[PDB]
Amino acid sequence: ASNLKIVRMDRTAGCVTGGEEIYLLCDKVQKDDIQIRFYEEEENGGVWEGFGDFSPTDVHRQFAIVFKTPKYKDVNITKPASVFVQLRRKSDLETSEPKPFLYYPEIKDKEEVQR
């Protein structure tokens, strides 16, 4: 029950490396009090977070946001890792209901750029 809510997303999964174009269609937001927080319940005590990179010029007409994926904590993993993503207000740290997101391994040694 809140003022924040994630509705759509051209993508629900990306690479553990991070830095990929992801379109999020949301509810009411102000280009300077909103953030795309990714997290994961460590399960033992602590927790993990990572925030989507995006300038306020990216938060289109208050109901959309284009952003980049925050490199997952452990970049080295041979098995997909499932986390969560939620919108959050810097002011009252109000939080949108969470949606699931999948982090998967970086291509077998990406350095196959041809050298």
Place this chain on the structure above:
Amino acid sequence: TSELRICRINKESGPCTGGEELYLLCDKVQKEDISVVFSTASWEGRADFSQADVHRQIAIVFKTPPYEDLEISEPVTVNVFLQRLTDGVCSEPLPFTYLPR
């Protein structure tokens, strides 16, 4: 009068076979009268999407329309523009190129 425009698109290229799903941010549009269109020199294709697929008049989730020449063997760039159903008014076209294979 009310210049409809497209702020950006999540993709710049896709399969010339179409059916691919994209997102586009744009200035207010009435979910009823509005439609995305791909065009070239002699061709025009209306993208597929439903009223429900327009998000608070600022974005539209739609599927790229199959190209005319489903056999091109070279990157065919075309124009992408909004266009109300009523008055026919468009929007500055965006560059979207279809891919071979």
